[PDB]
């Protein structure tokens, strides 16, 4: 156990992201398009897979 | 950092050994420190030491103990670190640690607690009731290495005052008894040691070592406190009634007779106190078990069990006196067991064995336990013959033979019969004549000062010169 607030603060940077389906890039959670050129700024995004 | 609540313990409302609001118990499953208390510890370093102590591997535990000791050594810097919360947690862990298989863990834990008492004197008063019984149990542990240092440290802690050490026995006697009860009655071999990591044996071995320490403590408590029997009778009865103390009286299996010896001492002490006479059931249970032990001694284990045999016989003689040999009456086959025991015992003689045998005879003669002529003499004669064939072989030989003669001579005196007199003379001559080098060992000759009138011995010397 870390602490509940400290787990929230660490998960803000480590777990509450989104993943581009084409190029696996770690993206902002409210993003609409990937920031990478190689996937062509696609809008195929998924949430980052949580535990539990 | 630490999570979870001991909800079950709250329902239980039993503090076990602890009187400070924390359950303290020897068994692994319960009495573990509460997580909230662990969070409350003053420093991160303390928390880490505790986590390591909880972990099963010994090397990790030893390192943690070493770290804790280092922190205590620098007390002035770390006085802030040690707080009631630390003491409550330590008390719960210390109990588990003292039962540890590894000696180093046991020794270090004892040293650490003593240091805490010296350094935090007068602030550990609340916790003295929890700590003192455990410290004492360590000082009364069969292994010399754990016990001697621990006692020396304790004496030093109390400024080398004998009175203080004795006072401790008196002040916490009720608590000391509670610890004994917990080991003897509350615990079982399984509870003390995890089954997965231990065999059926070993688990038994461990329990027995711990229980032996409890008995040694009980004997010490009785000696130190004269009025213990009256004040704590109910508690004493429950500890005594349980068969666990008595199960220790088995010589068929087991590494040492030291534990068995401790039980014998307890029975003797109880008889001297009169508790055994006072409570018949406890006495009968003890006596029957002792008789069973006599059967256990066998030719295969005679060498191993030989030191304990003089002691066993001596206790029996004392018990026989009670109730006019009432002890033999309890068991229908007791006489047979004794006869068998004697036959096995005679083959291997240990120092002091003969004196015990005579003592038994002295108690038994008034009530005619053994026929003097049909039964006893054969035992004596065979014994001398055996002694002669393989006498010098051993060292104690001179002492052992001396003993036989002194004892046999007394036995012979109460005969008023020709056969006994004849046997004495013939055996004496044989013992001296085949001999070995009886004259040469001056001590042996001195110890065996004489067996007959002076002039006759001279006549026999005369025959040897006169012989072909």
């Amino acid at each position: 156990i870390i602490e509940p607030s400290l787990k929230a603060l660490a998960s803000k940077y480590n777990c509450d992201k989104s993943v581009c389906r084409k190029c696996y890039a770690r993206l902002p959670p409210r993003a609409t398009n990937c920031r990478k050129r190689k996937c062509g700024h696609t809008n195929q995004l998924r949430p980052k897979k949580k535990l539990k | 950092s630490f999570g979870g609540i001991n909800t079950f313990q709250q329902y239980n409302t039993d503090l076990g050994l602890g009187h400070n609001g924390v359950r303290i118990s020897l068994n692994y499953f319960d009495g573990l420190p509460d997580p909230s208390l662990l969070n409350s510890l003053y420093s991160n370093e303390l928390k880490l030491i505790f986590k390591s102590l909880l972990k099963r591997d010994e090397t990790t535990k030893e390192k943690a103990l070493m770290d804790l000791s280092n922190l205590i050594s620098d007390f002035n810097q770390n006085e802030y670190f040690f707080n009631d919360i630390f003491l409550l947690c330590w008390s719960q862990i210390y109990a588990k640690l003292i039962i540890s298989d590894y000696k180093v863990i046991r020794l270090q834990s004892h040293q650490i607690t003593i240091m805490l008492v010296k350094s935090l004197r007068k602030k550990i008063s609340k916790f003295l009731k929890d700590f003192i019984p455990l410290i004492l149990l360590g000082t009364c542990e069969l292994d010399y290495s754990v016990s001697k240092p621990s006692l020396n440290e304790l004496t030093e802690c109390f400024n080398k005052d004998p009175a203080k050490i004795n006072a401790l026995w008196a002040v916490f006697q009720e608590q000391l008894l509670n610890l004994v009860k917990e080991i003897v009655v509350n615990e079982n071999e399984d509870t003390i040691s995890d089954e997965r990591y231990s065999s059926k044996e070993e688990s038994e071995f461990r329990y027995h070592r711990v229980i032996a320490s409890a008995v040694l403590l009980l004997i010490k408590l009785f000696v130190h406190n004269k009025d213990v029997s009256e004040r704590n009778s109910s508690s004493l009865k429950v500890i005594l009634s349980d068969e666990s103390i008595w199960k220790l009286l088995n010589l068929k299996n087991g590494q040492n007779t030291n534990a068995y010896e401790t039980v014998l001492r307890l029975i003797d002490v109880l008889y001297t106190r009169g508790y055994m006479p006072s409570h018949k059931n406890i006495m009968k249970l003890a006596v029957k078990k002792l008789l069973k032990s006599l059967t256990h001694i066998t030719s295969k284990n005679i060498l191993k069990v030989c030191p304990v045999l003089p002691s066993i016989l001596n206790l029996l003689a004392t018990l026989d006196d009670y109730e006019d040999g009432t002890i033999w009456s309890y068991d229908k086959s007791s006489k047979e067991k004794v006869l068998k025991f004697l036959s096995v015992s005679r083959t291997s003689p240990s120092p002091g064995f003969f004196n015990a045998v005579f003592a038994l005879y002295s108690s038994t003669k008034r009530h005619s336990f053994l026929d003097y002529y049909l039964e006893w003499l054969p035992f004596w004669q065979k014994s001398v013959q055996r002694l002669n064939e393989k006498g010098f072989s051993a060292r104690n030989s001179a002492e052992v033979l001396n003993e036989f003669w002194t004892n046999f001579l007394k036995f012979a005196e109460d005969s008023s019969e020709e056969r006994v007199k004849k046997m004495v003379e013939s055996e004496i001559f044989n013992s001296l004549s085949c001999g070995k080098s009886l004259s040469e060992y001056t001590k042996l000759n001195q110890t065996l000062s004489g067996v007959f009138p002076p002039d006759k011995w001279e006549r026999e010397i005369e025959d040897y010169f006169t012989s072909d």
């Binding site: - | 010994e58 590894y102 180093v104 065999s199 070993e202 590494q255 030291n258």
Partner: protein, 225 residues
């Protein structure tokens, strides 16, 4: 105690260490836990010497030790011999042995009073053992095992021998050594008991994989309680 120790992963402590009543010898290339076991258990009363014998980390199989004397092979250098002479107390005698078998811990199984040797040792080496160690010597094999030092662990109180040993050989060796002997295993069933562990009057050190019945057999036969 039979103390659980490893030599960097090795569960054979008799190979890398030699323990007597008066001194202890440990290899120079050892871990902190391995040194800390001997330092904590032995205490400050008994010197512990970090030594190398003949340029080798193995010292227990190279040397045969006693409270009165220490025997070293011919290949031991003058620097190692002088370091042992300075570090050891004045009571013990250190003498080089000039003998073909040259691995004295494997060759010789010895205690304070009586010793068992390899049958084929030279007579000068036997007299050298009897002189320096002050110990009476028998040439005997343990059920056909010529390496009595590797296949027996011996102390004053008792002895542990090879597990596959004839019972007649057990009472013969027990009567010859005047100590009780038990056939048993060490380090989760390893046959080499003398290489497996070291023992003296009050301490035994064994590998971590030595199981609890084996450790109980050790403390029972060596009377360490």
């Amino acid at each position: 105690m039979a103390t659980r120790t490893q030599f960097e992963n090795s569960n054979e402590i008799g190979v890398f260490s030699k323990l007597t009543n008066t001194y202890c010898l440990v290899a120079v290339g050892g871990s902190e836990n391995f040194y800390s076991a001997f330092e904590a258990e032995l205490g400050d009363a008994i010197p512990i010497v970090h030594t190398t014998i003949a340029g080798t980390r193995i010292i227990g199989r190279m040397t045969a030790g006693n409270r009165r004397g220490l025997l070293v092979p011919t290949q031991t250098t003058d620097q190692e011999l002088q370091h042992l002479r300075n570090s050891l107390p004045d009571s013990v005698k250190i003498q080089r042995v000039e003998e073909r078998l040259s691995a004295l811990g494997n060759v010789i199984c010895c205690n304070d009073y009586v010793a068992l040797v390899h049958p084929d040792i030279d007579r000068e080496t036997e007299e050298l053992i009897s002189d320096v160690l002050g110990v009476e010597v028998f040439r005997q094999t343990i059920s056909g095992n010529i390496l009595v030092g590797s296949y027996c662990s011996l102390s004053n109180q008792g002895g542990l021998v090879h597990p596959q040993t004839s019972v007649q050989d057990q009472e013969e060796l027990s009567s010859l050594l005047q100590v009780p002997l038990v056939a048993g295993t060490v380090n989760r069933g390893s046959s080499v008991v003398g290489a497996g562990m070291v023992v003296n009057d009050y301490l035994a050190v064994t590998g971590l994989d030595t199981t609890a019945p084996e450790l109980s057999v050790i403390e029972s036969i060596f009377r360490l309680q």
